[PDB]
Amino acid sequence: HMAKARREVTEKLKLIDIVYELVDARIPMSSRNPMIEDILKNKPRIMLLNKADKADAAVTQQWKEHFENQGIRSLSINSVNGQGLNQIVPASKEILQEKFDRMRAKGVKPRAIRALIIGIPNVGKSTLINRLAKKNIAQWVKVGKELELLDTPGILWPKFEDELVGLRLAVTGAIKDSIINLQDVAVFGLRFLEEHYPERLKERYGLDEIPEDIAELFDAIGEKRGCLMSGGLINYDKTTEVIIRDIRTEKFGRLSFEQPT
Ligand SMILES: Nc1nc2c(ncn2[C@@H]2O[C@H](COP(=O)(O)OP(=O)(O)NP(=O)(O)O)[C@@H](O)[C@H]2O)c(=O)[nH]1
Ligand SMILES: [Mg+2]
Secondary structure, three states: OOOHHHHHHHHHHHHOOEEEEEEEOOOOOOOOOHHHHHHOOOOOEEEEEEOHHHOOHHHHHHHHHHHHOOOOOEEEOOOOOOOOHHHHHHHHHHHHHHHHHHHHHOOOOOOOEEEEEEOOOOOOHHHHHHHHHOOOOOOOEEEOOOEEEEEOOOOOOOOOOOHHHHHHHHHHOOOOOOOOOHHHHHHHHHHHHHHHOHHHHHHHOOOOOOOOOHHHHHHHHHHHHOOEOOOOOEOHHHHHHHHHHHHHOOOOOOOOOOOOO
């Protein structure tokens, strides 16, 4: 993991011209893997804010400006329906123009661009590859006569100690919900919604007013959806799942858990 997947990237980097770093548009910063980026020094790259359809469009625009102003070419895309994928090859050619023109002038003929797909788990690396390759393949994945891709497994990093970063990753689905306390993530989700998207929270569960006590809000949602366990008692485990499901399936509309600056 922290070593296995890491060396796999270190090796494959020697065979590629450019890196396609996929991040979750809902959390462009918290979904960036510092451990991996460190290995990516000097190698050309494009930051791909995937799942842009699930994020707040205005905030996404802010993140793109933020990265570009730092010298990082960025593109917001939807790997499921194709939004923005037509900009990847064009961008890649512009970034590698100098390198390629230099090789051509030295007598080395042009070859198909070789790119590496990297990113945290569940960010959409396979979806993107399958869409670009126009085939269910997800090793050198061919994409027309202009691109060749290499896929890598989802990777996290050791010191992500910042509890906030962990909560954002957990709520968005970057971590298997089996090894974590899902209710704490649901509590984080609800507080986030109450602070940033209160109207959506109310309409979603038909709440005339949002309860001041987080536990009370859990009960409201439970009974509302019928999450009962022992002849009437609220099942908080099932209620937790509903909340997490609602957030991930866009039941609260487009969400962005962080903004630049
Ligand atoms: N709305 C939306 N969903 C997307 C997008 N890209 C991927 N997804 C969804 O996100 C989920 C995970 O995608 P997947 O390609 O398996 O991710 P991955 O990064 O290859 N996973 P791993 O790291 O485990 O190999 C899938 O349910 C997929 O349909 C996107 O742009 N928009
Ligand atoms: Mg995959």
